[model samples]
Target: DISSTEIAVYWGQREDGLLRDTCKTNNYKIVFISFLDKFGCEIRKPELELEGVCGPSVGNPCSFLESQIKECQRMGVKVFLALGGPKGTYSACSADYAKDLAEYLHTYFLSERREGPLGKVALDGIHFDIQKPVDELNWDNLLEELYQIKDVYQSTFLLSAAPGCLSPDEYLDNAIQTRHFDYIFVRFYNDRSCQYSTGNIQRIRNAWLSWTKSVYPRDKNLFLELPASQATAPGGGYIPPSALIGQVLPYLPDLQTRYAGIALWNRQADKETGYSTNIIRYL
Candidate 1:
């Protein structure tokens, strides 16, 4: 069973205690530290921060997060810094700037410059959650550069993307064609045209199947990311835990090797509903 469960955790949304407990208790494979933001990719200390459109603020020199990272890694759970939320400006920058961002990620986040605000603990990977690009930037080139930097290092530096399920995700359609991503968490929500509605199991499966065949042929790495609860992401594809475990998950084995796993949008919401705990029992 090449299956796993993942969730995102915005900085400051949950305390380190809650985060540690989630990792220790739940059999989650990955926990993404949400939204690195687009601060010119300079990798500065106090100047760097995580600002959500409508949630708690997280300051730089995040001394609070170090232990959480250590604990997650200690539990054999991979942690990643997700970049480019709806507000980020990464995709708008030029290819040269993209190259610069890639180096910044490799040095500060992954390897080399591991001191300062980032602390001694290293991140397992980078996740691109680019909602939209302000301009038509060359992300494929950026991935190539990042992959090259990753090659020089001995450790596994995972590169993943979170693209909305609009068949061919406009932002990543071209880039994904050339670059090899470790995984893709397709946001099967928000877009009403394709989102999983009540009793839409076949519809949801077909959309994911299309992605495996057309968008990313590597089926084992493609995950279906959804809101943990209806309130978690209002208007997003919010499937109930019962429906997901009873209807969706059971049918996924039909895809066999193409079945990747499940990913909840965020941990704060999952904590509120115990959604991961319920569905993970079946996955």
Candidate 2:
């Protein structure tokens, strides 16, 4: 297993939050996460009824986001404010709202400090977490709007996206969108598991890296996120995090050329052995 020492520091909650001395060695960097949808600030308060039961506390209101950015800077790690997550309101309003959200952040946070302390992140870049289903999206307008956002924030920061890895057929859309982003993080972990045969896992890994390379610039910083562990299925089955490390990490050495780095989907439920370092034995 890769036994990754890597951590995805959310701009809001430090999975390795400000509390624990967990990151004492400083092995990871903070990637400030944000969301924008077809609806302006996806972070805005929704009518309680409109809010879905499954996703709040998911990360919204961009509530403590700015503070997280400042914290990352204080710790000296680069802050990349992410955008367009799965939770965003993608409706007929997508285009206009996206533009407004981009402009709002750029004006208030990216270009200048708002009412915060003297030093604010203004952000290092933007990461678009489009959880779009690959096979179906024509995304012509979607691509255009993303580019416009990139153009709007030109030179000041980087642009990135989190695309899934399931079908090779979706490579075309991946390539098309790659043109608009500076980084492409292929999500490989969520549903992937021990149940997936070796062949299936190989197909996923291959498609994930190949698509990134085929379309994106050679320098495009492509990364993959592995789920910490799998859900307990049925009465007895489960994919332990250990199985994941053994399977996915081995694939990385072969992919260095196509990828920039790898990340963990989350640090949500801290694990002891499998995905968490807490249980690994110290030599």
Candidate 3:
């Protein structure tokens, strides 16, 4: 079951305020929410903010750490909490809890062992947002460390990653070590565009398929994450859904059978034509 043999969603609940609108159409059973942290914690550090971009400056919109769970449970949704996000540190927590975090989460949130109350909803998994800058991660040891985290959660919950287009070695390190987890969502479509022209979608797929196959379980759930709309980059032109639905999807059939499924970077980024219509259509 840990094998990536199916589809899942990478959704976020932002304070700009609209969880209902974003998730309304996504019938996906596996929904990975943006984040959660212990009470009285600073989820975003000033250093991690993208230059000139805004962040959790006001501190987790209305006690982000405390109340959002109720909303998730109200909607009858399953959840996965991501740690070490846009601004969190893996090294900040005690290493002993790595594997225990998985069990602890399921106990406190999902199945609720020892007469523990169920969480606002249920937390099905834990995702690691390892976007701590290109060189910030201690690349070599990162994989085994995360695997240790997976050790305890093996049969019970899912363990996943939100990784960027880093080097092959870094990704393989995590993939090989995480032979036990559910999947890896390789964030693909964000900044692939360029000045002369946006990058090659097929080539990107080829590389991901090639590299992922090296260590990723062929029958497991692995997905490439794409941007939703015509979001332009400082590098060049925007990548529209039309480009994907019109062209990219046709060419990606090979990858579909290779990985488990595709996931969007966010639920909010979809177009009016609808995400299920465009993104999930190919799936």
Candidate 4:
């Protein structure tokens, strides 16, 4: 069941205590346990860096998170393991690299082998976010590999990506071209040319038109990714709830099939501002 009003937020980057605590608020429909950034491409060993949420290891470590992740799932919030953000030596440029990542995620997060950072509890999906540029990294091949394992598992392990609002993403261009993603969270912030600004929605509207029309031909959901507050994204793109409801939301293309509502970068600043709550009715 996909919803146009559903909101997704990243969890691991913030200093917020428990994963369940944020889910209890019921503001977001989907949660992405961010940044398995230092990924194991060709057997360098993957790493799950959750800021201060968990210690430094995987498997038996972070036992508390393993349980809370299941609780969040029980609360009907779909949890995803986000891959690659900001700084990290990660790449999926080769078919073999994709294959290795598929097997590693399968063994750790999605399979009966069941001993990774989050332990035996199953992750609902994968969030493909390439914040770092690698050597001609083809993420489209990576998505294909993830789906292969999902098919064998006989349940949908949802796929998603965070592309800049420039329509076709730089790193995930080949990946976005293929239509395996369940949702594409277009980061409308960061990019000055496309992000929303005070009393103006034209730039963002144009970007949306591009992404919603020629670039994305499928019925897959696309979300407007924005910062929770002015304090959040230093790169500068924060639309107040009133502005979003007034200037932006009203101007968005009325096509309901592809619009998957909004996604916040992280939860910490969101909590500080109640950003999600403020925009709830309009969203």
TM-score of each: 0.86, 0.64, 0.64, 0.92
**For residues 135-186, what per-residue lDDT tens digits would candidate 1 score against the true structure?**
5467777777788787777668798888888778888877777647878888
Q: State the lDDT at 163 in candidate 1.
A: 84
Model 3, runs deviating above 4 Å: 1-10, 13-21, 37-78, 89-94, 97-104, 114-121, 133-155, 169-172, 190-199, 232-239, 253-256, 271-276, 280-283
lDDT of 4 by residue, 209-262 (tens): 888875555574778889998987787789998888777776777446667678
- Candidate 1 has an lDDT of 0.69
The model with the greatest TM-score is: 4
Candidate 2 positional error at 112, Å: 2.6
Query: Per lDDT, what order, best first?
Result: 4, 1, 3, 2
The 10 consecutive residues of candidate 3 with the worst lDDT sum are: 45-54
Candidate lDDT values, in order = 0.69, 0.46, 0.47, 0.79
lDDT of 2 by residue, 1-283 (tens): 2332334533223343431232332534645343334333253322111122112453333333446456655786656655445454443135455455555555554665453211344666656565643223333344455467657656456666666555433423543444776666666644443223443456555566566555546552666654444442232222345444566545653454555555555434343223545324320
- Candidate 4 colliding pairs: none
Lowest lDDT sum, 10 consecutive residues, model 4, at: 55-64
